[PDB]
Design an enzyme around this catalytic site. Structure first.
Site, PDB file in Angstrom:
ATOM      1  N   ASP A   1       7.588  -1.366   9.722  1.00 53.31           N
ATOM      2  CA  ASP A   1       7.315  -2.652  10.339  1.00 53.31           C
ATOM      3  C   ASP A   1       8.004  -2.741  11.701  1.00 53.31           C
ATOM      4  O   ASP A   1       8.689  -1.812  12.151  1.00 53.31           O
ATOM      5  CB  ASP A   1       7.788  -3.770   9.413  1.00 53.31           C
ATOM      6  CG  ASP A   1       9.293  -3.781   9.263  1.00 53.31           C
ATOM      7  OD1 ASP A   1       9.841  -2.851   8.638  1.00 53.31           O
ATOM      8  OD2 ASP A   1       9.935  -4.699   9.825  1.00 53.31           O
ATOM      9  N   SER A   2       7.853  -3.900  12.356  1.00 57.84           N
ATOM     10  CA  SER A   2       8.356  -4.057  13.713  1.00 57.84           C
ATOM     11  C   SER A   2       9.872  -4.095  13.782  1.00 57.84           C
ATOM     12  O   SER A   2      10.433  -3.841  14.852  1.00 57.84           O
ATOM     13  CB  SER A   2       7.819  -5.346  14.333  1.00 57.84           C
ATOM     14  OG  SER A   2       8.313  -6.473  13.602  1.00 57.84           O
TER      15      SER A   2
ATOM     16  N   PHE B   1      11.611  -9.129  11.414  1.00 53.04           N
ATOM     17  CA  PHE B   1      11.772 -10.175  10.406  1.00 53.04           C
ATOM     18  C   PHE B   1      11.873  -9.695   8.958  1.00 53.04           C
ATOM     19  O   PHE B   1      12.556 -10.340   8.153  1.00 53.04           O
ATOM     20  CB  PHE B   1      10.627 -11.180  10.525  1.00 53.04           C
ATOM     21  CG  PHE B   1      10.589 -11.892  11.843  1.00 53.04           C
ATOM     22  CD1 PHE B   1      11.484 -12.920  12.120  1.00 53.04           C
ATOM     23  CD2 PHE B   1       9.673 -11.533  12.813  1.00 53.04           C
ATOM     24  CE1 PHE B   1      11.459 -13.567  13.319  1.00 53.04           C
ATOM     25  CE2 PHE B   1       9.647 -12.195  14.020  1.00 53.04           C
ATOM     26  CZ  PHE B   1      10.532 -13.217  14.268  1.00 53.04           C
TER      27      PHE B   1
ATOM     28  N   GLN C   1      -1.898 -13.935  11.618  1.00 53.44           N
ATOM     29  CA  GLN C   1      -1.043 -15.081  11.308  1.00 53.44           C
ATOM     30  C   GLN C   1      -1.882 -16.353  11.185  1.00 53.44           C
ATOM     31  O   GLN C   1      -3.076 -16.287  10.860  1.00 53.44           O
ATOM     32  CB  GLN C   1       0.059 -15.226  12.372  1.00 53.44           C
ATOM     33  CG  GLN C   1       1.110 -14.064  12.374  1.00 53.44           C
ATOM     34  CD  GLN C   1       1.892 -13.959  11.069  1.00 53.44           C
ATOM     35  OE1 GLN C   1       1.972 -14.918  10.304  1.00 53.44           O
ATOM     36  NE2 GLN C   1       2.474 -12.783  10.810  1.00 53.44           N
TER      37      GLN C   1
ATOM     38  N   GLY D   1       1.993 -13.607   6.538  1.00 54.36           N
ATOM     39  CA  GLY D   1       2.334 -14.993   6.283  1.00 54.36           C
ATOM     40  C   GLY D   1       1.920 -15.557   4.940  1.00 54.36           C
ATOM     41  O   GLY D   1       1.973 -16.781   4.773  1.00 54.36           O
TER      42      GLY D   1
ATOM     43  N   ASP E   1       2.158  -4.008  -0.315  1.00 55.39           N
ATOM     44  CA  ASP E   1       3.574  -3.715  -0.499  1.00 55.39           C
ATOM     45  C   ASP E   1       4.214  -4.940  -1.138  1.00 55.39           C
ATOM     46  O   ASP E   1       3.731  -6.063  -0.964  1.00 55.39           O
ATOM     47  CB  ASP E   1       4.288  -3.393   0.821  1.00 55.39           C
ATOM     48  CG  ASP E   1       4.648  -4.656   1.607  1.00 55.39           C
ATOM     49  OD1 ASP E   1       5.683  -5.285   1.308  1.00 55.39           O
ATOM     50  OD2 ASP E   1       3.911  -5.028   2.530  1.00 55.39           O
TER      51      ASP E   1
ATOM     52  N   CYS F   1       2.034   6.027 -20.490  1.00 57.71           N
ATOM     53  CA  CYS F   1       2.548   6.148 -19.133  1.00 57.71           C
ATOM     54  C   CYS F   1       2.977   7.582 -18.882  1.00 57.71           C
ATOM     55  O   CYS F   1       3.784   8.108 -19.648  1.00 57.71           O
ATOM     56  CB  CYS F   1       3.747   5.229 -18.936  1.00 57.71           C
ATOM     57  SG  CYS F   1       4.490   5.385 -17.340  1.00 57.71           S
TER      58      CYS F   1
ATOM     59  N   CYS G   1       4.950   8.716 -16.617  1.00 47.68           N
ATOM     60  CA  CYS G   1       6.164   8.833 -15.841  1.00 47.68           C
ATOM     61  C   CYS G   1       7.214   9.602 -16.638  1.00 47.68           C
ATOM     62  O   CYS G   1       7.158   9.666 -17.870  1.00 47.68           O
ATOM     63  CB  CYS G   1       6.679   7.443 -15.432  1.00 47.68           C
ATOM     64  SG  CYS G   1       7.896   6.627 -16.497  1.00 47.68           S
TER      65      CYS G   1
ATOM     66  N   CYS H   1       8.910   7.724 -19.627  1.00 44.71           N
ATOM     67  CA  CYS H   1       8.155   7.558 -20.853  1.00 44.71           C
ATOM     68  C   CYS H   1       7.897   8.899 -21.532  1.00 44.71           C
ATOM     69  O   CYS H   1       7.716   8.938 -22.749  1.00 44.71           O
ATOM     70  CB  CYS H   1       6.849   6.817 -20.558  1.00 44.71           C
ATOM     71  SG  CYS H   1       7.206   5.081 -20.064  1.00 44.71           S
TER      72      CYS H   1
ATOM     73  N   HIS I   1       9.904   4.272 -13.731  1.00 45.23           N
ATOM     74  CA  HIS I   1       8.780   3.768 -14.519  1.00 45.23           C
ATOM     75  C   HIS I   1       8.024   2.650 -13.802  1.00 45.23           C
ATOM     76  O   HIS I   1       6.785   2.609 -13.823  1.00 45.23           O
ATOM     77  CB  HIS I   1       9.261   3.246 -15.868  1.00 45.23           C
ATOM     78  CG  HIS I   1       8.203   2.479 -16.580  1.00 45.23           C
ATOM     79  ND1 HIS I   1       7.168   3.094 -17.252  1.00 45.23           N
ATOM     80  CD2 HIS I   1       7.956   1.147 -16.633  1.00 45.23           C
ATOM     81  CE1 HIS I   1       6.348   2.167 -17.726  1.00 45.23           C
ATOM     82  NE2 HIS I   1       6.801   0.980 -17.357  1.00 45.23           N
TER      83      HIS I   1
HETATM   84 ZN   LIG Z   1       6.732   5.088 -17.801  1.00 45.19          ZN
END
Ligand SMILES: [Zn+2]
Ligand SMILES: [Zn+2]
Lengths: 389, 366
Positions: A94-95, A98, A189, A216, A266, A304, A306, A309, A335
């Site tokens: 980002d810039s 903020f 914006q 925003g 995000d 899952c 991951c 798991c 996870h």
């Molecule tokens: Zn998991």
């Protein structure tokens, strides 16, 4: 017209939800995509190999914090953020004006840029649009964001900040000398004001930048106002360029906003729930600190993929949350990131196989049950693009 | 329940609404503005100490309709549910600040939006919701979207009369709503012929009062529609108006027979970080301006609100810059106190026959 970085590989025949690909300098990214914050992962002990193994091909860098430690000069000497932090895939920054900046550290915005305060009446620091671009050039991220005038707010300040964001967009475009190497995104914006946001959409899309973000909307407003502003934005942003909805990341929000036409997302909060012991699942979340998990020897989610798991039970994690919390937070953060990436992967697969409305119905039924238990805003938003529950 | 005029002076009605049954409401006056059942940013305890607080508070169906299920289970009404069981409540259909999207009115239903999803209300659904709310007064279901074409305006009158007759019928069969008062709604848009028909026909029904709908800006053309309408209404029932709250507009409507106003204007001022400073016995100041960072005066010298007696402009400036809820608390206390004091001065001016002088004092500052 500049070359386009995105192509669409499929569009939901019912809703128009988009499955796409972004051709970025450190690799192609499938969309829709959720983008975790890299430093949030490294804070929890997640290595490049671990994050790569979860399927992540783009993560965020927070420019304010990176600009504090290690600072832009050091990152420049390290040949960019990719080199410094050993990350071979894509980065979005980002810039630095903020995101994650305390209002205690900000003086009032002026036309010259954002003004940072130092402790105990010290001297201030100016971040101009030009310096924001220069910093992000040094970071070397694949996508860089314009400096915008962000407000939390009613009255003339919303309109004033919207038009300043347009002027700052032009200054960032002029300062960014290498669009062949990094992609500058504009940020829409206008707050919750349909007329102001419509104006911002009309004016910013006159600039030939490679992508557009929707700013925003991450917090504060009613859900009714939220989804209407998302839909207004996607109705006016170019179809042939990506739409990045900033700060939105809860699972239901993600599914609905894909249905409304968004491509990139995000959010720090779903993954940060791990810090409190909560694990994301298709029914919502498990609070693994609860006593009911002390003798629950199943994984968080048997399906899952991951590492947590594949390896560990709820009971083991419950014990670690009490007795070895730092280790537990690594496992839960892995996870929770995995869940977010799996969710978006499943969304995308469903669009490619032209079964996205069925996917949404199954997602909502698993998460909430009967349609009368689903969030009313989400039922209405989905109905607006033809998806009935 | 009776409206007794103390004096009528130059088209301006000074009086009191009594037996509301030990409660009174002064006219001309305002209703306390609330959002989702709370005066914005203020607690029951803080509201008690604001001087000149109206005797009736406004609730908005748009912010409450989505809570019908819980209120129906509670059974004892919304005033009790929100912790104000002894306060008087008028329930309007729409919120004047966040009115939601237009174009959903039919001859069968009207829709409202609060935090979440559309709540579509037929007459029976609307009345079922009012049975859960049990307000003291409520605006009847109505079509106020005519000006939002004589065809569109004629429909708003006929839809609203059908709604009114249907709601009166259902109220006859409702035990809990026997102690509630329906407010008839004058529609007709910007068509003079329809406005007069709406006014005369609504006055034929046994409503407790009238809501002047559709005058939100207020043009000189609509002001003449307004006085044309109030001439057709009986003198002994109160006249409410929605969407008209700025002090100059309030005075124009009082001169044309309007009694009760919404108080969302001081809320709007609070939300833009501003404080009302106009004299009624600059118009507003913006506390984010840097000139206030070291200003240790109160918002208004001589104001007796909890904000001005105990806090400085400098502190409010700082609270705004750090986005603290206390900034909204202190500004809302002051802005309500100032606005209610303005209404007290209107009634005092009517008593002294000096409303024309107060009107010029307000205009001077705008
Ligand atoms: Zn998991
Ligand atoms: Zn005061």
């Amino acid at each position: 017209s500049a070359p386009r970085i995105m192509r669409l590989v499929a569009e939901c025949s019912r809703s128009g939800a988009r499955a796409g690909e972004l051709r970025l300098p450190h690799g192609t990214v499938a969309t829709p995509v959720f983008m975790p914050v890299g430093t949030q992962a490294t804070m929890k002990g997640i290595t490049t190999e671990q994050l790569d193994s979860l399927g992540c091909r783009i993560c965020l860098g927070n420019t304010y914090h990176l600009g504090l430690r290690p600072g832009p000069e050091l990152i420049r000497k390290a040949q960019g953020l990719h080199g410094f932090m050993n990350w071979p895939h894509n980065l979005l920054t980002d810039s630095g004006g903020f995101q994650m900046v305390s209002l205690f550290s900000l003086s009032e915005v002026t036309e010259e840029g954002v003004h940072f305060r130092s402790p105990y009446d010290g001297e201030e620091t100016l971040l101009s649009p030009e310096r924001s671009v220069e910093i992000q050039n040094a970071l070397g991220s694949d996508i860089i964001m314009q400096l915008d005038h962000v407000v939390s707010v009613t009255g003339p300040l919303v309109e004033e900040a919207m038009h300043r964001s347009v002027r700052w967009l032009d200054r960032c475009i002029a300062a960014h000398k290498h669009p062949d190497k990094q992609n500058l995104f504009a940020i829409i914006q206008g707050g919750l004001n349909a007329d102001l946001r419509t104006t911002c959409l009309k004016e910013m899309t006159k600039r030939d930048v490679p992508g557009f973000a929707i700013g925003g909307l991450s917090g504060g407003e009613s859900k009714a106002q939220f989804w209407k502003m998302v839909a207004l934005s996607t109705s006016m942003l170019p179809k042939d360029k990506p739409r990045y909805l900033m700060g939105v990341g809860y699972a239901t929000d993600l599914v609905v906003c894909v249905a409304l036409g968004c491509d990139m997302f995000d959010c720090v909060y779903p993954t940060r729930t791990a810090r409190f012991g909560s694990a994301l699942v298709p029914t919502g979340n498990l609070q693994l600190k609860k006593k009911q998990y002390a003798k629950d020897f199943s994984p968080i989610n048997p399906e899952c993929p991951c590492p947590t798991c594949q390896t560990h039970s709820r009971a083991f994690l419950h014990a670690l949350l009490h007795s070895d919390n730092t280790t537990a937070l690594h496992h839960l953060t892995v996870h929770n990131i995995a869940y977010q990436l799996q969710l978006l992967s499943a969304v995308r697969s469903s669009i490619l196989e032209q079964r996205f409305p069925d996917f949404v119905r199954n997602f909502m039924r698993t998460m909430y049950g009967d349609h009368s238990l689903c969030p009313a805003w989400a039922v209405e938003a989905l109905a607006s693009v033809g998806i009935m529950l | 329940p009776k409206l007794s005029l103390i004096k009528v002076v130059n088209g301006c009605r000074l009086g009191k609404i009594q037996n509301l049954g030990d409660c009174t409401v002064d006219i001309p006056g305002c209703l306390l503005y609330t959002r989702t059942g709370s005066a914005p940013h203020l607690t029951h305890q803080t509201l008690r100490n604001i001087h000149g607080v109206p005797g009736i508070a406004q609730l908005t169906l748009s912010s409450l309709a989505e809570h019908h299920e819980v209120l129906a289970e509670y059974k004892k009404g919304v005033g009790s549910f929100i912790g104000m069981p002894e306060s008087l409540f008028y329930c309007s259909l729409h919120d004047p600040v966040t009115p939601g999207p237009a174009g959903y009115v039919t001859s069968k239903s009207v829709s409202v939006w609060g935090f979440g999803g559309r709540v579509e209300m037929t007459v029976s659904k609307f009345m079922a919701i009012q049975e859960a709310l049990q307000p003291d007064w409520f605006q009847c279901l109505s079509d106020g979207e005519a000006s939002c074409s004589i065809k569109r305006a004629r429909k708003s009158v006929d839809r609203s009369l059908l709604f009114l007759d249907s709601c009166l019928r259902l109220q006859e069969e409702s035990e809990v709503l026997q102690k509630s008062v329906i407010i008839g709604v004058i529609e007709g848009g910007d068509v003079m012929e329809e406005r007069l028909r709406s006014a005369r026909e609504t006055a034929k029904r046994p409503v407790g009062g009238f809501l002047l709908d559709g005058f939100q800006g207020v043009t000189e053309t609509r002001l003449h529609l307004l006085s044309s309408v109030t001439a057709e209404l009986p003198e002994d029932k109160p006249r409410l108006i929605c969407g008209v709250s700025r002090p100059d507009e309030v005075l124009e409507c009082i001169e044309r027979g309007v009694d009760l106003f919404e108080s969302f204007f001081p809320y709007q001022v609070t939300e833009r970080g501003c404080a009302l400073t106009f004299t009624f016995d600059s118009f507003e100041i913006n506390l984010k301006e840097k000139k206030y960072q070291e200003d240790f005066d109160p918002l208004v010298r001589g104001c007796s609100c909890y904000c001005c007696k105990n806090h400085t402009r400098a502190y409010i400036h700082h609270l705004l810059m750090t986005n603290e809820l206390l900034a909204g608390v202190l500004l809302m206390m002051h802005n309500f106190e100032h606005y209610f004091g303005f209404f007290c001065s209107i009634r005092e001016a009517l008593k002294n026959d000096t409303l024309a002088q107060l009107k010029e004092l307000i205009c001077r500052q705008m």
